């Protein structure tokens, strides 16, 4: 449980 996940750029 945290915030919106966008990923560490590939």
Curated annotation (Swiss-Prot):
Q: Where in the cell is it found?
A: Secreted
Subunit structure and binding partners: Monomer. Interacts with human chemokine receptor CXCR4.
Identify its protein family: Belongs to the intercrine beta (chemokine CC) family.
> According to its UniProt entry, what is the function of this protein?
Blocks infection by several different human immunodeficiency virus type 1 (HIV-1) strains. This occurs because vMIP-II binds to a wide range of chemokine receptors. May form part of the response to host defenses contributing to virus-induced neoplasia and may have relevance to KSHV and HIV-I interactions.
What protein name applies here? Viral macrophage inflammatory protein 2
Q: Which organism is it from?
A: Human herpesvirus 8 type P (isolate GK18) (HHV-8)
Please name the taxonomic classification of the source: Viruses, Duplodnaviria, Heunggongvirae, Peploviricota, Herviviricetes
The record's gene field reads ORF K4
What range of the full-length protein does this chain span? 24 to 33 of 94
